[model samples]
Target chain A: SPGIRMSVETIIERIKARVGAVDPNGPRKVLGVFQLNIKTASGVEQWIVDLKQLKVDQGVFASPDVTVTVGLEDMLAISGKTLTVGDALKQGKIELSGDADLAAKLAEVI
Target chain B: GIRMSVETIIERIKARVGAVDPNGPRKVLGVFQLNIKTASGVEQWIVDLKQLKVDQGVFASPDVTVTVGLEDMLAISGKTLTVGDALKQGKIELSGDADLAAKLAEVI
Candidate 1:
């Protein structure tokens, strides 16, 4: 359970950091949320990405701009590499969601 | 953190590129780094991709100017989100020359 949270948190933090590096200013005001299941050699990890608002009740984490489902082993292998998430997705190694344009601007945000 | 030097990353890129065009003289595709530097005196933070996100700016961009952290970058290369959508997730940055970006994207 904790690993899932850890992996998800790491991913979220990295995403945020990257986004900040990309824009530095503020983005065009958007939100993204998702329920993810990352497969690792041990098991599967699940977490939610909520970017709707600032409260527990609000945000897009529920619906997600994109939803992902990957193998447990695959997630573990990718946790600390230089592969870049895009490389994996294009290969159909993962599943996803809505709005490609908005997703692009949102991608670099971290 | 399994960090590889930027040079190594570039190397990996070169290898991937070589898989297709051994000589790579086609000039058919290119992936550009948007290289965003948020300088002061700027309102919405500017994107400094090749020609900057000033033009056809796209999901893939003429260049991948979008910045993505090591984890996501790894996740991307490891085959996670579709590069097109991942670029949009803020996991990656991009701007300018959509066509060129498309060509370069193949190298990755």
Candidate 2:
């Protein structure tokens, strides 16, 4: 297996597809929004997930429950599992705000 | 049939409390507010989770504030939508106590 470059759009698409496989009703118990700010080869992009409504859309929510920022390189590494999120956070590879617990659970979406 | 309106949605949720757990204690967990944008304009609603009441104005210091479209609120509260997918789509905005915001998922 080898790693390949992925665009922000692709990442969002993957998240969208993955949600279908998860407990459709399970997330209903969780509220708030999780915003991801990824700096890619092109530029920065924002993505949001509103748990209360259960929809994935592009752009930022007016106010998110949790915000996570990551560099493209670190995002790739995290996806490849070569880099753990904890390490990235400790290394300052990603910037976070709002709920840390919510940020930690983003693996379900990422 | 009663048409779906802001008041209708609130009343529905208020009524739900009675049906869900009438014997449950009236505890105040946190304060929450909804800032909804629709074709008409923005509408706000405040909720005191512990007090089990919905007021027409905003709370002094809500634990959570949710910014969403009127349609989005109706869609989810009406069970026509799921909370997780809505987030992925960036349809709603929520700020404040994460745990407290989540409790709304059960209510609406």
**Winning model by lDDT:** 2
Tell me the deviation in Å of residue B47 in model 2.
0.8
Error of 2 at A77 (Å): 18
Give a tens-digit lDDT track for model 2, residues A1-110: 12223455556666676655567566443566878788866667778867656688888788887877788677767766577654554355666667633543453344
Worst 10 residues of 2 chain A by lDDT: A1-10
lDDT of 2 by residue, B5-65 (tens): 7667777766765454535653227777878787777777876666667777877778878
Worst 10 residues of 2 chain B by lDDT: B99-108
- For model 2, the superposed segments whose C-alpha errors exceed 4 Å read A1-109, B1-4, B18-28, B106-108
In angstroms, how far off is B12's CA in candidate 2?
1.3
Candidate 1 ranges with C-alpha deviation above 4 Å: A1-25, A28-30, A41-43, A54-62, A72-81, B1-108
Alpha-carbon DockQ of candidate 1: 0.13
Local distance difference test, each candidate: 0.46, 0.64
TM-score of 1: 0.36
Q: Write down the TM-score of every candidate.
A: 0.36, 0.48
Each candidate's fnat, listed in order, reads: 0.26, 0.02
